[PDB]
């Protein structure tokens, strides 16, 4: 069930690792090939995977519409990359030593245990309040003042890509006299100025 | 009175899990946020009572690590200080966990 576990952590559940659209990853029942008081860590480890799938299920559907939202999605693909990288590292380990235990992966995968729950709720606010427009630039910044150095350096990267859209529309407008917008995205709608959608900082 | 008659090496593995902060262990079954040794554990030696003695001490250490894990849990699931305080505590646990995990090897 070693290789069975890694695949479940990548988005492919099985019989021993059932899937639910409401709860998420969870151990099904008791198995005779597992320790009676070991199922604990697997359920805790599965909570790391349950976040991962809801990422992809949100990414693939892209669901709300707007370039800033869509570009925020691709920005979310960059931060998840070390999670894809570090998980693949274990493959070289077990093929080398086939007798490793289930405890080692928890000791290796502690850093990602903390990053997701802080960034996962950032997605929840968007799906629960319909944050449409440039206001996404503030919701990512409002949590950018977080205390955790890794969580700060993660959303920092998304901001570094999310601004990649604003700078472009800002450049094509402040230099050529036309605006590239069709969904009430830019904060400039005889033109006027918008304050209730203007960024915070 | 019946007893389970566990082997010897199995205890050390269980003790390592208690050090790790994991719950729901065949030994050290907590009841009210207070880890407590079971009553039917016995080895071929150690007359069934010294085992209850030696485990009772390690249990006292489990309380120190179980309560802290309960604290870190109640922060993950904008104070900016407790949240910044656990990150120091959390950082210490990872390194401490590595020494315990290595022994299991």
Swiss-Prot record, chain A:
Tissue: Ubiquitously expressed.
Domain of life: Eukaryota
S-S bonds: none
Subcellular location: Cytoplasm, Cytoskeleton, Microtubule organizing center, Centrosome
Family: Belongs to the TUBGCP family.
Disorder named in the UniProt entry: Microcephaly and chorioretinopathy, autosomal recessive, 3: A disorder characterized by congenital microcephaly and chorioretinal dysplasia associated with poor vision and nystagmus. Variable ocular anomalies include microphthalmia, retinal folding, retinal detachment, optic nerve hypoplasia, absence of retinal vessels, round areas of chorioretinal atrophy, and attenuated electroretinogram. Most patients have mild developmental delay and mild learning difficulties.
Subunit note: Component of the gamma-tubulin ring complex (gTuRC) consisting of TUBGCP2, TUBGCP3, TUBGCP4, TUBGCP5 and TUBGCP6 and gamma-tubulin TUBG1 or TUBG2. TUBGCP2, TUBGCP3, TUBGCP4, TUBGCP5 and TUBGCP6 assemble in a 5:5:2:1:1 stoichiometry; each is associated with a gamma-tubulin, thereby arranging 14 gamma-tubulins in a helical manner. Gamma-tubulin at the first position is blocked by TUBGCP3 at the last position, allowing 13 protafilaments to grow into a microtubule.
Cited function: Component of the gamma-tubulin ring complex (gTuRC) which mediates microtubule nucleation. The gTuRC regulates the minus-end nucleation of alpha-beta tubulin heterodimers that grow into microtubule protafilaments, a critical step in centrosome duplication and spindle formation.
Name of the featured protein: Gamma-tubulin complex component 4
Curated annotation (Swiss-Prot), chain B:
Tissue specificity statement from the Swiss-Prot or TrEMBL entry: Widely expressed, with highest levels in heart and skeletal muscle and moderate levels in brain.
Superkingdom of the source species: Eukaryota
Localization per record: Cytoplasm, Cytoskeleton, Microtubule organizing center, Centrosome
UniProt function note: Component of the gamma-tubulin ring complex (gTuRC) which mediates microtubule nucleation. The gTuRC regulates the minus-end nucleation of alpha-beta tubulin heterodimers that grow into microtubule protafilaments, a critical step in centrosome duplication and spindle formation.
Record family assignment: Belongs to the TUBGCP family.
Quaternary assembly: Component of the gamma-tubulin ring complex (gTuRC) consisting of TUBGCP2, TUBGCP3, TUBGCP4, TUBGCP5 and TUBGCP6 and gamma-tubulin TUBG1 or TUBG2. TUBGCP2, TUBGCP3, TUBGCP4, TUBGCP5 and TUBGCP6 assemble in a 5:5:2:1:1 stoichiometry; each is associated with a gamma-tubulin, thereby arranging 14 gamma-tubulins in a helical manner. Gamma-tubulin at the first position is blocked by TUBGCP3 at the last position, allowing 13 protafilaments to grow into a microtubule.
Name of the protein: Gamma-tubulin complex component 5
Native species: Homo sapiens
Name of the coding gene: TUBGCP5
């Amino acid at each position: 069930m070693i290789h069975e576990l890694l695949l479940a952590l990548s988005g492919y559940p099985g019989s021993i690792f059932t899937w639910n659209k409401r709860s998420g990853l969870q151990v099904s029942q008791d198995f005779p090939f597992l320790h009676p008081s070991e199922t604990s860590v697997l359920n805790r480890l599965c909570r790391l995977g349950t976040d991962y799938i809801r990422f992809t299920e949100f990414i693939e559907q892209y669901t709300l519409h707007g370039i800033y939202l869509r570009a925020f999605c691709t920005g979310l693909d960059s931060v998840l990359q070390p999670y894809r990288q570090a998980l693949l590292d274990l493959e070289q380990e077990f093929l080398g030593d086939p007798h490793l235990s289930i405890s080692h992966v928890n000791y290796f995968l502690d850093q990602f245990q903390l990053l997701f729950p802080s960034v996962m709720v950032v997605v929840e606010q968007i799906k629960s309040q319909k944050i449409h427009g440039c206001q996404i630039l503030e919701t990512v910044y409002k949590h950018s003042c977080g205390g955790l150095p890794p969580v700060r350096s993660a959303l920092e990267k998304i901001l570094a890509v999310c601004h990649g859209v604003m700078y472009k529309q800002l450049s094509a407008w402040m230099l050529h006299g036309l605006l590239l917008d069709q969904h009430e995205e830019f904060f400039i709608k005889q033109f006027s100025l918008r304050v209730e959608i203007l960024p915070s900082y | 009175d019946d007893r389970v008659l566990v082997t010897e090496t199995q205890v050390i593995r269980e003790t390592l899990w208690l050090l790790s902060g994991v719950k729901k262990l065949f030994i050290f079954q907590l009841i009210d946020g207070k880890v407590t040794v079971r009553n039917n554990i016995i080895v071929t030696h150690l007359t069934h009572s010294c085992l209850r003695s030696v485990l009772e001490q390690i249990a006292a250490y489990g309380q120190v690590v179980f309560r802290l894990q309960e604290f870190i849990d109640e922060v993950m699931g904008p104070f900016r200080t407790y949240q910044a305080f656990m990150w120091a505590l959390y950082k210490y646990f990872i390194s401490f966990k590595e020494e315990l995990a290595e022994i299991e090897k």
